[PDB]
Each structure stands twice: as structure tokens, then as C-alpha cells.
Design a protein around this nucleic acid. Structure first.
Ligand SMILES: [Mg+2]
Ligand SMILES: [Mg+2]
Ligand SMILES: [Mg+2]
Ligand SMILES: [Mg+2]
Ligand SMILES: [Mg+2]
Ligand SMILES: [Mg+2]
Ligand SMILES: [Mg+2]
Ligand SMILES: [Mg+2]
Ligand SMILES: [Mg+2]
Ligand SMILES: [Mg+2]
Ligand SMILES: [Mg+2]
Ligand SMILES: [Mg+2]
Ligand SMILES: [Mg+2]
Ligand SMILES: [Mg+2]
Ligand SMILES: [Mg+2]
Ligand SMILES: [Mg+2]
Ligand SMILES: [Mg+2]
Ligand SMILES: [Mg+2]
Ligand SMILES: [Mg+2]
Ligand SMILES: [Mg+2]
Ligand SMILES: [Mg+2]
Ligand SMILES: [Mg+2]
Ligand SMILES: [Mg+2]
Ligand SMILES: [Mg+2]
Ligand SMILES: [Mg+2]
Ligand SMILES: [Mg+2]
Ligand SMILES: [Mg+2]
Ligand SMILES: [Mg+2]
Ligand SMILES: [Mg+2]
Ligand SMILES: [Mg+2]
Ligand SMILES: [Mg+2]
Ligand SMILES: [Mg+2]
Ligand SMILES: [Mg+2]
Ligand SMILES: [Mg+2]
Ligand SMILES: [Mg+2]
Ligand SMILES: [Mg+2]
Ligand SMILES: [Mg+2]
Ligand SMILES: [Mg+2]
Ligand SMILES: [Mg+2]
Ligand SMILES: [Mg+2]
Ligand SMILES: [Mg+2]
Ligand SMILES: [Mg+2]
Ligand SMILES: [Mg+2]
Ligand SMILES: [Mg+2]
Ligand SMILES: [Mg+2]
Ligand SMILES: [Mg+2]
Ligand SMILES: [Mg+2]
Ligand SMILES: [Mg+2]
Ligand SMILES: [Mg+2]
Ligand SMILES: [Mg+2]
Ligand SMILES: [Mg+2]
Ligand SMILES: [Mg+2]
Ligand SMILES: [Mg+2]
Ligand SMILES: [Mg+2]
Ligand SMILES: [Mg+2]
Ligand SMILES: [Mg+2]
Ligand SMILES: [Mg+2]
Ligand SMILES: [Mg+2]
Ligand SMILES: [Mg+2]
Ligand SMILES: [Mg+2]
Ligand SMILES: [Mg+2]
Ligand SMILES: [Mg+2]
Ligand SMILES: [Mg+2]
Ligand SMILES: [Mg+2]
Ligand SMILES: [Mg+2]
Lengths: 210, 147
RNA sequence: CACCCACUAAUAGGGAACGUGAGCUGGGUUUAGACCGUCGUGAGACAGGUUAGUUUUACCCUACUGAUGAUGUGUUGUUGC
RNA sequence: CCCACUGUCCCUACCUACUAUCCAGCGAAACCACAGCCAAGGGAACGGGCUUGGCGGAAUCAGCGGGGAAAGAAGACCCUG
RNA sequence: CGGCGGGUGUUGACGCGAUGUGAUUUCUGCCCAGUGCUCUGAAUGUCAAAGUGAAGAAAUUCAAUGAAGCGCGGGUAAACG
RNA sequence: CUACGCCGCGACGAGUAGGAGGGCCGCUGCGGUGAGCCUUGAAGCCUAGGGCGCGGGCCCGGGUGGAGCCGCCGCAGGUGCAGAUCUUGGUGGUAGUAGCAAAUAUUCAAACGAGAACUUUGAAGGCCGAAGUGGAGAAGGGUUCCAUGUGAACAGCAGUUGA
RNA sequence: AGCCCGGCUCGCUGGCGUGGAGCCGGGCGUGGAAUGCGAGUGCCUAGUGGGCCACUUUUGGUAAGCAGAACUGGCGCUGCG
RNA sequence: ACUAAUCGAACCAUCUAGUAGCUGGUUCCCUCCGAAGUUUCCCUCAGGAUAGCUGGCGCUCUCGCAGACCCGAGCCACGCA
RNA sequence: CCGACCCGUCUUGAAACACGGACCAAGGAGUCUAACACGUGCGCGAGUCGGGGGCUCGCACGAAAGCCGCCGUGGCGCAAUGAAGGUGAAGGCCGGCGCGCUCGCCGGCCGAGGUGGGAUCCCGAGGCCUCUCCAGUCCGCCGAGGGCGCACCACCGGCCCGUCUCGCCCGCCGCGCCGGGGAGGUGGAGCACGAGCGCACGUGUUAGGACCCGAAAGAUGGUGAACUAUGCCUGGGCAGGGCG
RNA sequence: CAGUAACGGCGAGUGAACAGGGAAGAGCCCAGCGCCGAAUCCCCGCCCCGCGGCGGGGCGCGGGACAUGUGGCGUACGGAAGACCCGCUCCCCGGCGCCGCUCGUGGGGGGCCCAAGUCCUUCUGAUCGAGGCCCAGCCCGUGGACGGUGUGAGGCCGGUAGCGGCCCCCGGCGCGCCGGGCCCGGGUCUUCCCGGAGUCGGGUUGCUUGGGAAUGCAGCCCAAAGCGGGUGGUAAACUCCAUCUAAGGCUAAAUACCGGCACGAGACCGAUAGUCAACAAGUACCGUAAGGGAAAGUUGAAAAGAACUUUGAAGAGAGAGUUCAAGAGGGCGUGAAACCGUUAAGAGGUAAACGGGUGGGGUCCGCGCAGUCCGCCCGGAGGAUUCAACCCGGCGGCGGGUCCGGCCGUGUCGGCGGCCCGGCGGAUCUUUCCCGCGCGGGGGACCGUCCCCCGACCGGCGACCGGCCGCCGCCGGGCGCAUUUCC
């Protein structure tokens, strides 16, 4: 029964909710268990980075988030190809790959290939047999310079190009932003029907003299 | 704390604050928002007008990200840069104006509430309102669009 | 209630939880079975008729009926008012 | 309805068995606000209590069925949901 | 629930199944308007899906066609009445 | 002059349903604190003992008891009972009362025994009366069968007897 | 927030410097009946939503400790003489 | 009728702590304030919503706070009933 | 001696011939979660909040506490309005100009207007002082009037969005069934120099067993023909007389 | 995201997804098209090496499966074959011996062990209680968790702490060898090859979903295509674009866990509570059965569980005895109320009971029973340091131009002082000196807060302190030894 002013409320408690209630008294235990598993994994892959493979630089999809950039699933095969890495050796040397990702733009392509080349320049490779160093690395740069890396490998970071203050020119002063936006909306709205009317006008024009 | 509640003061009073005549019964009037058009109609009309009926066009699969467009007003416009920027522009001898990138600050549309300090500025935004553009021009600045 | 027979001095009218069911009886009404008439499409209904249908407990308190006793006169008895 | 028959009755009496009764032994239950003498008054319009009057004498036994609007069942009639 | 499953049925109209009335005797009258049941489809009115044709760019729309049933028409009361 | 304290003056005081405030009212547990209490006697309980408070309640004496307990500042509740034909347990009056009354019936002597209306033996009087109160089975029971012993309880009196 | 002087605005009204409204300056306190009292204002909100009675007015009814209204007071919620 | 003392739909367990506008109960003290049985709407008339009546929390103001004992030195508050 | 009917409960009305209550002990009924609303307390404040994750001898306490900051993603708030496409909250004065036509172009300032009330604050003529005076030095109190006016209230303007009516201008890399602007009414949960966020507590309402106890019922899945009802199979049993 | 889009007698109510941030992160295999002398697989005998989950190697003119298709290459990220160029790059499997000894400090399991008071005096039935233990304080403490022991125990016992010790067993990690397999990888060009059918899809029906002219699933009917097919949240036609590639298969981690095995803990309950069950509890018992289902903890430190005498046939008593206690006596800790017996006191014909006011009696209480004290002064009779005042020492309070420091707050200057020789920030400018295409990451400059700093002035010694003086007060020791002072 309503009582004076109030909000019309709709509790979703008509469906025997007390049989399915998830308490969280095992949350600290879960955190401890996850931390122990992380430490055990980091010990197991001793010089390899604890967080795992390098991830590609990836722009977020929708119009809400396309200004941001984050870490993807794996480097695309086009990126690997133009970086000169085999798609079956990348996962061995710790490069995550994503065969189903495409590269629409050369800017993102080149950003990810410079990322791959930087990772390859910073990689230390241990020979399979330590007593037979075939092509991995010099022993001097892996005796003590090898160290397990903590955190994501080369973390993906949003960068802003800072523009210095400049003198406003008369052309910029005479640009009409609101009018341009309104006319752009109108043109995109009426583009199709304008073309249809031009079509019909041309059809009457080609037969006007008969 | 249950020691701070009415139940500790209602010990010894038989009806427990619910009356001897009307008592405290299970659900007089119905359960939930029952009878909102029949016997709770006065309450619903008085405090929640518009509750019953449909208005407008429904639209399946609404995606909020598509219509995401945060707005910022001209009075808060200069808070998006550092104070060093504004003081340097004010004391700058040449007519060089700083650039404010509201998309970088997280806003897509610049609205026109407030007034601007009398100094030029370039504003980069996805959308501008008519009065916001008028005020930015009025202070000698420029409005430039981004996608 | 009524009505008649007969006697009679007279066969007056009433109340008491329309006195009186742990007093009785159970003929009537007023469960369940059943028949008829009328009503209802029907289930079924009928201040309409008919028939068959479990009437439980007092040892408590009082009331009443009887039965011992009790108070006081020192005990006790007889005769008495 | 008639004959016969008879304690159904006039109109009650007597007898017998088993009880009830008293005793030795044994030994419950129902029910219980507190309790238990009345008249009238007023009162939820029928009081055990209240007011006004009548009055009131320990502890009990066998009966009794006027009252306790006695007990047994959250009325089955009627209405409401 | 289901299977060409099962009961009557190891049966076959002097048999199974469904009803009403209730031995014997003597009778069982009139009504087919109503509601049922049943017979005949006769040009037949209505009549779903599918199928046919047309219009349209298609979705779609329209039209023709016309199963049972209902309407139309007979019979029937030891059918309800 | 614990300023959340202290002091002054004036007016006022009914109360169901209901609302609010205060509680140095009370219960259980937790964090602090009382260099707290306690086998030279804790809790609990009992008391014609002494008192305090408007009150909820509390303190102290005496007895019993025999191992734990309380004050203050906060914290947290499964936190206060006369009722619910309340739940469980216990106990009264009724009340030494109703009652131990269906199927005819017992009596005498003796034995054992602490003890005999009821057990055993003998004598007598009766009953079932062969469609039995007789002799044997099925179902069901499951050791009740037999002997010896006991006399707590049970056999609605009793028992020396007994399923 | 009154009264009395000037002045200004109007796209309303209009013979008219008209009318009306608004706005701006300025001057007037004997505070323009009695009596009493400190007022204004917001939020949240329980219980209730069976009433009954008396004077007087009053409708239905033969009437009712009947049924129904008006006004004030009361009982409910309230003891005391 | 009968279907294990159960039959106008057995028994057992579970859904199930089924729902109840209806009945019953609802646990310490003191202090302050203190009702309603009426309006409107409702398949409403034993119930709700709504206004009214109540409480709590406030806030905005008004009178002055007087002489350290003493000692006033036409005109005497915003407003309300 | 005076007063004094038995409590609880529903009720207009209970001592009731209204119901529950023989007695005693122990148990026994507004709780927790979620969501709101308002009030109060605390921190920060146009912000606020790490609650999810991660980092810290992993662990008596510690399942705590601490930390992150390129973990603030995100939530709520900071902007509303419209069904929507969409649009989206600054004015006042002095001017020079068209034609200062109720309006178009710029300057300079100031930066949410105005009226009436309005706690507080400011100025204040004049008064209050001593053994007295002609003579001013310092500050204190009262003070008629006057001024700036907080919050808040009433009113009048103004601004944003929707929608009507009227009408005239302006813009162009798209001259368009294009875009923008004005005046006057009106609809908005708006603006008009933010007040929110988090946490805690209280009250109220609600969904949940929902203060406690209480149906007649409904559904699902099982157990029963040792009683009875009926069919079948296989056994057993029923003196003595009359009629004829 | 979000109680949102949406569904809903659009009522009550119901209600996802995408993006974003995290935990975890891992990818792949066939069929088909093809090539390769079926290259393939199972079984049975024989030998050797093993046993420990039965494998390895070899042999069989030994059987069978299989061309109605086994194996190798290969799978949509393309693949294959040829050439040309370049690189030999180093795989996995089970043992022999031993390290780093497996690691947040054993990897796991099992066993046995490891500090210090029973010190002195006392309380008690017994104490683990109380008092004490010089040297800064009984002893140990990386151990002061807990439990037991006749109380309440860090030191009596078990344990507890410890990258403590010892023993036994098991398991994964590197090297050299062992047995054997194990077979070429990348880039360019050319030539070839490329896909899952009663399935998709459509109609209709029923259920389901937030899915709304139909989200998913299924039945029936229809029934595909190959620049094709599906999706693109409003039915349809045309058109462009985007996105994936269905109708075959496998795959760890993050996640769930009211049953099980073994543990740890708790602001929980404390025998009518907490599980129904603290106990011979799913037991006793009930029902034909399905099924229903309790009640019930406590002597004492130790049985020391009452020998013996006596009455009785016995139950049961009286003595005695054990014990700290039987006023703890085998359903025995404590032992309430209701109810009952007895004793004592009081009372009694209006049922008891109650409120107010007295009175009588009684039990107790008051150390009731000659009634307080204590400040000054006066008088009497006694004692005694010492009373004041001075001297020395100690310590405090207050004041002092800052007497002198130490400083302190706000500013204020050169910044000698810091991007080498002080920091952190900035949406501020730059190499116009430095490593990535005319295109970054550094390094500089500047700005803001800073940091200690060298000094000064300004206001103060403050509640931030010291040293000096000055005054006052207290205390200790001298003197003062009597008309003072005190008891
Ligand atoms: Mg009350
Ligand atoms: Mg009511
Ligand atoms: Mg009568
Ligand atoms: Mg009678
Ligand atoms: Mg009778
Ligand atoms: Mg009769
Ligand atoms: Mg009958
Ligand atoms: Mg009969
Ligand atoms: Mg008798
Ligand atoms: Mg009488
Ligand atoms: Mg009833
Ligand atoms: Mg009933
Ligand atoms: Mg027949
Ligand atoms: Mg037809
Ligand atoms: Mg005929
Ligand atoms: Mg008074
Ligand atoms: Mg009062
Ligand atoms: Mg409780
Ligand atoms: Mg009780
Ligand atoms: Mg009560
Ligand atoms: Mg008797
Ligand atoms: Mg008898
Ligand atoms: Mg005989
Ligand atoms: Mg026999
Ligand atoms: Mg025998
Ligand atoms: Mg006996
Ligand atoms: Mg009414
Ligand atoms: Mg009336
Ligand atoms: Mg009432
Ligand atoms: Mg009143
Ligand atoms: Mg009164
Ligand atoms: Mg209606
Ligand atoms: Mg009622
Ligand atoms: Mg009642
Ligand atoms: Mg009544
Ligand atoms: Mg009453
Ligand atoms: Mg009465
Ligand atoms: Mg009655
Ligand atoms: Mg009742
Ligand atoms: Mg009763
Ligand atoms: Mg009771
Ligand atoms: Mg209790
Ligand atoms: Mg934490
Ligand atoms: Mg954000
Ligand atoms: Mg306005
Ligand atoms: Mg509310
Ligand atoms: Mg309930
Ligand atoms: Mg129930
Ligand atoms: Mg139903
Ligand atoms: Mg049978
Ligand atoms: Mg939200
Ligand atoms: Mg659902
Ligand atoms: Mg991660
Ligand atoms: Mg093949
Ligand atoms: Mg030891
Ligand atoms: Mg111990
Ligand atoms: Mg110990
Ligand atoms: Mg150890
Ligand atoms: Mg579409
Ligand atoms: Mg229990
Ligand atoms: Mg107990
Ligand atoms: Mg005996
Ligand atoms: Mg003792
Ligand atoms: Mg005992
Ligand atoms: Mg006694």
C-alpha cells in the first residue's frame, strides 16, 4: 500500500531468491589463492615475464571509447609478416598472436610493428643447451641482465600530442562551426532523395522535346 | 543497534504501536503496487502522474555508446587546462591563443552556459552549440571541429 | 387452540427463560434414506402431503430433603418453657 | 376397528437378585478467574460479587435434580468473506 | 500416454452392448409445434486450412471454388416431455 | 564552575489509540578500563534482617553453596511475559470420591509359610453338560512350553501363586 | 501595501495634453474602534476512517432504550463531589 | 455406500512457514504531547487510498535582556483572533 | 473505621448470564536482507566513492589493517527538453550610425536584472561622565534618522528545450523541398555563480515466511483390497418337524 | 552496463546484451580436394630387455581388418608441387651417478625427540592461591597458545617457538653415457587445389525468450545454392556496403560445491537451547506399508560406594564408619516455585483477597541505655624540640630593555648555493647540441611548489626552551635553648 509521496518501487523478490544467494565470505581466501597461484606461475616461468606475452596496441571499438587505446588479444598476422616474425615462432618467443584480427589502417599497422620490433630488440633469448650457444644471445647479456619482468610487457599507454599556442588566423575566425554541422547533417539526411529527384529531372529532361 | 529502536520501547504495550481497532494484519489493500487504478488511484494520480499508458516510439536494441555525448559549458571550459596555460596566455604579448581539447578532457559537445574571460582561445570539439560558438568568437577565439 | 360426550358447586382466565428435556417422552418442526404433487433443462427446491430416523454427564458449589454434630451453661442427666 | 388378554391406567402395593449404603484393601476422570444464601434497584435491558434491605454459626453423611444463563464442541441454523 | 495395443470375445443377432418400466390380469388414449435423436442430399444459403486465378516490385490484397457442421426437408413420444 | 555543570524566577501537571524523550532500569556476549572481586569462599538460591529510588530496580547483613563474577566508557543482540482453547515439564482441589455389580457358589480341616478369603492336598456342595468351561489342529504369536528359585516391580484386593 | 504632490513608459484605449495600468522621485505617524494574545513557515508522520449520548431544531414511524439529520457540549479517552 | 476406526474423492511425504480485508496474542519504568469514527474515490459496505484530526524535528522572525545592590528615564512590537 | 465487583480482550457500552484464564517453572511474538524517502551525525566537497581487482613474512590476532592513481573502468552529481530527428541555458549602461524604424553593425566597462519585505553589519545629528568653569585633547554607552543588504518569501523581467501565431532578414566550396536568426502566447520534473558523493544512525513504506499462531483448499510423487465392495480359483458347512 | 533497451489484461510484474575495467589466458584436429607401390591397424605364436599399471626391440611364404579407403603431408590463419635464394640451425622418449639439494626458506607423507621453580614461608581436603627470591631485580622466553594435573600453572606433564635435530619412504627437475627412434626449415616466382544436405532456408503449429510482423527449440509440409550462404533487433522489393564461413571433432586456467575424506576457526547455542540425536539416536516405540520418531548430561579429588552391632521375613531403620562435605549415599553438583506434612505465633458466623489510616502483639535492628564533636581564646599544672630573625645549600614561581643564547611566525633580499652539487610537479616553452621518417623517445630552459641553507630587518619568548641577575616561596643543615613555639 502506498503511503503519501514516494517512489513506485519494483523489487525483484517474487522468485524464491533465498535459495540462490551468493555470499562472499570466501573473497579474502580467493584473493590469497589467486596470489599464490600467480607466484607459483611466476616461479615456474622463471626468467619469462610474469604477466605473460606482449599484447598489441588496440583502439577501442565504439564511438564512446575510440579515443582510448588498450591492449588486444594478439598481434595480427599482417603485423607479424611485415615485422618478419613467423606466426609459429612468435608464440614460442612470447608474442601473442591473433589470426582473426585484421588491419584496416596503416597507422595501427605501423604502431604495432614498431611495438614488435621494440620487443624483439629488448628480448633476451637463452640457447636450448647452455653449453652450446647456437644463435640465442651472448652470455654476458644473460648472465645477470636476465630478470623476470613484473607487470604487463611494455604497457599500452594513451599519449596526447600537445599543441603549442598559436596565433588564430582569419580563416579559422571566419569558420562557422554550428552552421557547418547543421548543413552537414542536412546533406547527409537529404543526399539520397536529392539524387532521386535529380534522376527524375534528368529523365524528364531527356524527353522534354517530343 | 537494536537497542536504539522502537521495539525496545514497545515492550508492555499490547498492540506494539499498531492500534487496537485496525490491528496489524497481513496485507490490507493488496501486495506491492496493487490496485493502482482501482483503490490506490488517488495516490497514484496525486504523486505519480503519467504512470499508466504508452508514449512515443519504442526502439529495439538501444546502444548507449552510440548516443554517448558528454557536454561541457563555457564557464567550466578553462578548467580543462592548467592554470599556467591561462596565466601565460593572459600575460602573453603576442596574440597566440592556447588550444583546449575537450575531447582529450573527455567531452564531445561544448555548450554555451556562462561567459568567457576576455582572451582568445582555440577550442577543439566534436560539436558546438550556436551560442557557445558565438561567445567563443566574441572573445576573439575560434571553434575548430574534430571527428 | 378447537369441537363434542358426560359428570359437576364450578368445570374462570393467566405468570413463573411462551415455568419445567444432566425430569421424562419424542408425536410435531428441523440433517442424512425414500415416495407423490407442483416448480426447474438440470443439479435440485417447496411455512405442500407422507414414511423411517442414536435424546450423552452430577461424585463439585449452592438450593431443598432428610441425618449426625457444633457454640455457651464446670461435667452429666431428667423434666420442661 | 373388533374379540381375547392383561398393573398401560384407576392406584398403587409387596417380594427376589445385583447394586447403591457401611467397612478392609485399591483407587481415577470430567471440570476449576475467584467463589458460592436471597429480594429489589440500576447495569451489556435475567447478579454470586455492586447499591439498599433481609440477614449470616465449625466439620460433615445419604439423596436430589431448581440454579451455577453447569459440562461436552472456536454454532452444523442465519449472515459476511 | 503409446503400439492395428486391450475387454466384451474360448463371443456372432435365441449374441453382445445401452436404456426405461417392473410378477400375473386388464389396458396403455391425443400431440413431432419446442428440445433431442435420426434419414436424404436435390438445385441447395453459410462454411476453415490447403489448393486455383488475377493485381502488385514483393510483403500483401482481391476473386472464384465450396468438407463436415449449421440452415432447408422427412421420420420418431414404451425420446425428454 | 562533572559549563553535558551549578543557580534564580514564573506558570503549569487527566488520558485510550498513537508519537517522542530520559533511564546511575534490567539480560547476554565483544573491544577497552577498574595494578577490580574471589577457596580467609564466585555464581545461583533462601531469608519475621537493614536500607535506597516516584519507578523500572539496586545495595548491604545472615544462611546454603562450592568456582568463577561484576562496576565504568563504547559496541552487538535470538534482550524483559499473566494471558495466545499458547509449547514442554511438574503439581493441586475434585478425592480416599466415582468406582473394583454381565455369564447361580461356595464351605470345612490340614500342610508349607513371618504372613492364607484367593496357594497345595483331602472332604463336601455346585457349574460347564459332548453345538462343553472337554480333547486336538490351521492362521497369528515366538519361547509364552518344562523344572528350580525369588517376592523389588507387574498380575487395577491379595498371593506362599503366575503366561 | 495608506493618503497627498509632481514626473516618466505603453505596441492597450482614443476627438482631446483622453482613459487605464505600470514605473520613478518627494512630503505626510494623532500607527486612525474595543479587548486579548508573541507570530510566520517547512519536512517527516502514526492512529483513525463501526461511534454513542444530552438540551434545542428536525425527518420517517402509533411508538420505541427505534431509524435518520443540524448545532454545541460530553462519554468513548475521565478519575473526583 | 465401501475402499485398514478416515470417504460428496483414502493414506503418506513434499511444494509449504501455502493465502487470510477474519479471530487470538504481542514481554521494563518514568516524563511530555495527544486523537478518530468525518470528506472524496474504490466489485467498497468487517478493507484500503485520500483530506482532516496527532506527534516529532526544526527553521525565520518579533519583545526586551539593562543599570555590579539600588535606580523608567502625542509616542510605546512583526502579526494574529 | 472508611473505600473497594476479576483480570485480559473486541466493543458505543464488560463486573457481566460475552470469550480466554485451576496452579507453578522454563520457552514465547515487528526480526534480517534489498530498495526507496526524509531527518540527524561524520569526512571530503564540484566533486565524491575502490565496494571489484591488484601489491604488501600469507595466515596468533590478521578472513583484519595498510597501499594503488596511467587501477576512477564505472556509479551518482555537475543540464535540461522533445515521441523523435535534434537542439541545448548572461545581461545592464554610455555612445557615436542606417531610419538607434521597438530594430541591424562595433567600442568601452561591469558580469545573472529589478521591486517590496529582510536577521546582521556600517554611518550617524544629538545625548550620558567627574569640585566648577571660557579651553580641546583620547577612546566607551544610548541614539532620531540614513546606508549596504544574507538566507528566505511574494511579485515583475530575462535565458534554454517542445509547440502554435506573425513576419522580415542573413549564411554558403554543396543555392538547396538547405542552414540560421526575430516578435508574441503557451507546455517543461529547467537556467538565473553549483551541493553533491560516501559512510553511520533513526523513522516510514514496500518485496521477501515478514510481528507470532491459525484454514476449507490446490499440485507433485508414492503406499495400501490384513477391514470392506465385486469377479475368478480351490476347500469347508447348514438339527428336527409341516405342507404335499 | 542496469532494474536499463525491451516484454506485459503495457496491469501486477518481468528483463537481457554490446562496448569498458579486471581474474585467467592456449590453441588446434579431421572429412573433403589431392600425392605417396595400404605407406596403415589389430590379434596369435618365438626370442631378448623389463614386470609392477604390462611396454620396448626383432622374427613368422603366421591369421585378420582394410581400395564400400588405413596411414603420412594438409584445413580456410589458405594448402600443395616445382624451380631460385638462404639457413643446418638440434626433437621428444625411459634408465645409470650425483649435485643446485624440490625452495618464503622439507616438495610431500610417517615416526622419535629438544627451555625454564614443584625454591623459602604460609592458606587449603588438595592446591595451580598469597607473600618472597640482593645484584635491577628467582629461571626460560624465537617458547606468556592450549590442554591435563585434588584451585585459578610460562617454568609438574604433554605440547608451544625455532630457515631446530635424527630416522624411514615417495615424487618432478641438469649434466656425460645408455636403448632405439627422429627428419629439412624459411622467403620469392610460377603452376595447381580448395570444403560438412532432408542440411540451410520457407510455411505452419506448440513451447520458450527481454526479443517486440515472431529470440531460441521442436513436430509436420516444402525444400536449396555456389561471385554462394548466414548475420546486419520492423514485415517487403531493389541496391550498395560491412562481417563471418553453418549443417564434423578435441581443448587447461580463471568458476561452482548444504554429499564425502581431513583440518582450522567463531562478538553463535549452552541440555525445553544447539542437529531429531552432547547419552547403547534415526535408537526405543507407532503404522500393513509408504512413513512418523522421542525422552534421557553432572556423587566424589579419590569408591575412600558405608566394615561391624542391632530390630524386622524383607523393604526399611537406629548406632557406627569414609570424606572437607553424605544437610555429596549409585537417576547421588546446586536444589526455586506450585503443592504437601509437622512445629511455632496469631486469627476466624457476612468467601477470601486488596487501598488509605491508626492501634495491639512479635521478630529483629540501633554496642540506645547518662549522650557527640571541633576551631579560637582564658586559667591551671607538665613536657619538648626548637619560635621568629640571620647563614649556607638545594629546588621551584614570577619578571627582565633579549640582559645572552637558543630560537619561533610572517614576509625579504643575492640566490654562492639543485636536474653533475637536494626534491616533486606543470595541457609552459625547446634539439633550432642527442640514437626512430622532412616524422619519436631523451636532454635542456622556464614556471609553481620545495628543500635545507648562508645572513639581515619586522613582531614575540609565547602555552618551544636554557644560562644569568632581581624578588618571592618551600625544604635540608647550622645558630637562635626560652615572657618564643609546639604536644
Ligand atoms: Mg499507550
Ligand atoms: Mg474497523
Ligand atoms: Mg418454555
Ligand atoms: Mg432443566
Ligand atoms: Mg435431555
Ligand atoms: Mg419423529
Ligand atoms: Mg429426511
Ligand atoms: Mg426403523
Ligand atoms: Mg456414594
Ligand atoms: Mg437475586
Ligand atoms: Mg465461530
Ligand atoms: Mg465451526
Ligand atoms: Mg429389466
Ligand atoms: Mg455443405
Ligand atoms: Mg406417430
Ligand atoms: Mg492543576
Ligand atoms: Mg500526563
Ligand atoms: Mg525473543
Ligand atoms: Mg508463564
Ligand atoms: Mg499482556
Ligand atoms: Mg466407594
Ligand atoms: Mg461396585
Ligand atoms: Mg448342570
Ligand atoms: Mg475346544
Ligand atoms: Mg508354565
Ligand atoms: Mg495387586
Ligand atoms: Mg461509518
Ligand atoms: Mg438516533
Ligand atoms: Mg474504542
Ligand atoms: Mg478529549
Ligand atoms: Mg469526566
Ligand atoms: Mg471498479
Ligand atoms: Mg471485529
Ligand atoms: Mg475478545
Ligand atoms: Mg455489541
Ligand atoms: Mg473487562
Ligand atoms: Mg447480564
Ligand atoms: Mg456462552
Ligand atoms: Mg470471541
Ligand atoms: Mg475456561
Ligand atoms: Mg492454559
Ligand atoms: Mg520466562
Ligand atoms: Mg584490505
Ligand atoms: Mg569515466
Ligand atoms: Mg518570472
Ligand atoms: Mg514515506
Ligand atoms: Mg507466519
Ligand atoms: Mg499454515
Ligand atoms: Mg484452484
Ligand atoms: Mg481379501
Ligand atoms: Mg543507474
Ligand atoms: Mg520469466
Ligand atoms: Mg590479466
Ligand atoms: Mg586420406
Ligand atoms: Mg617442558
Ligand atoms: Mg588448569
Ligand atoms: Mg598451564
Ligand atoms: Mg615442532
Ligand atoms: Mg530494418
Ligand atoms: Mg535437545
Ligand atoms: Mg538445566
Ligand atoms: Mg516392598
Ligand atoms: Mg556442602
Ligand atoms: Mg542433589
Ligand atoms: Mg509450612
Amino acid at each position: 500500500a502506498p503511503s503519501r509521496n514516494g517512489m513506485v518501487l519494483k523489487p525483484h523478490f517474487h522468485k524464491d531468491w533465498q535459495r540462490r544467494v551468493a555470499t562472499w565470505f570466501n573473497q579474502p581466501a580467493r584473493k590469497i589463492r589467486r596470489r599464490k597461484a600467480r607466484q607459483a606461475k611466476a616461479r615456474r616461468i622463471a626468467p619469462r615475464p610474469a604477466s605473460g606475452p606482449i599484447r598489441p596496441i588496440v583502439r577501442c571499438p565504439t564511438v564512446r571509447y575510440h579515443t582510448k587505446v588498450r591492449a588486444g588479444r594478439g598481434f595480427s598476422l599482417e603485423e607479424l609478416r611485415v615485422a618478419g616474425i613467423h606466426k609459429k615462432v612468435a608464440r614460442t618467443i612470447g608474442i601473442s598472436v591473433d589470426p582473426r584480427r585484421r588491419n584496416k589502417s596503416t597507422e595501427s599497422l605501423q604502431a604495432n610493428v614498431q611495438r614488435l620490433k621494440e620487443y624483439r630488440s629488448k628480448l633476451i633469448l637463452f640457447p636450448r643447451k647452455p653449453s652450446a650457444p647456437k644463435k640465442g644471445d651472448s652470455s654476458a647479456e644473460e648472465l645477470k641482465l636476465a630478470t623476470q619482468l613484473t607487470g604487463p610487457v611494455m604497457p599500452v599507454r594513451n599519449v596526447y600530442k600537445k599543441e603549442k599556442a598559436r596565433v588564430i588566423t582569419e580563416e579559422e575566425k571566419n569558420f562557422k562551426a554550428f552552421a557547418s554541422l547543421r548543413m552537414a547533417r542536412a546533406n547527409a539526411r537529404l543526399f539520397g532523395i536529392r539524387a532521386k529527384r535529380a534522376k527524375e529531372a534528368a529523365e524528364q529532361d531527356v524527353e522534354k522535346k517530343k | 543497534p537494536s537497542r536504539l529502536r522502537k521495539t525496545r520501547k514497545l515492550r508492555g504495550h499490547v498492540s506494539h504501536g499498531h492500534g487496537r481497532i485496525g490491528k496489524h494484519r497481513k496485507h490490507p489493500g493488496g501486495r506491492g503496487n496493487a490496485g493502482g487504478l482501482h483503490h490506490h488511484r488517488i495516490n497514484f494520480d496525486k504523486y505519480h502522474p503519467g504512470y499508466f499508458g504508452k508514449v512515443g516510439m519504442k526502439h529495439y536494441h538501444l546502444k548507449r555508446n552510440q548516443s554517448f555525448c558528454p557536454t561541457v559549458n563555457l564557464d567550466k571550459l578553462w578548467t580543462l587546462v592548467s592554470e599556467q596555460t591561462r596565466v601565460n596566455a593572459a600575460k602573453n604579448k603576442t596574440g597566440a591563443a592556447p588550444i583546449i581539447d575537450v575531447v582529450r578532457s573527455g567531452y564531445y559537445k561544448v555548450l554555451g552556459k556562462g561567459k568567457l574571460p576576455k582572451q582568445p582561445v582555440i577550442v577543439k570539439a566534436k560539436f558546438f552549440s550556436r551560442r557557445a560558438e558565438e561567445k567563443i568568437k566574441s572573445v576573439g577565439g575560434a571553434c575548430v571541429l574534430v571527428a
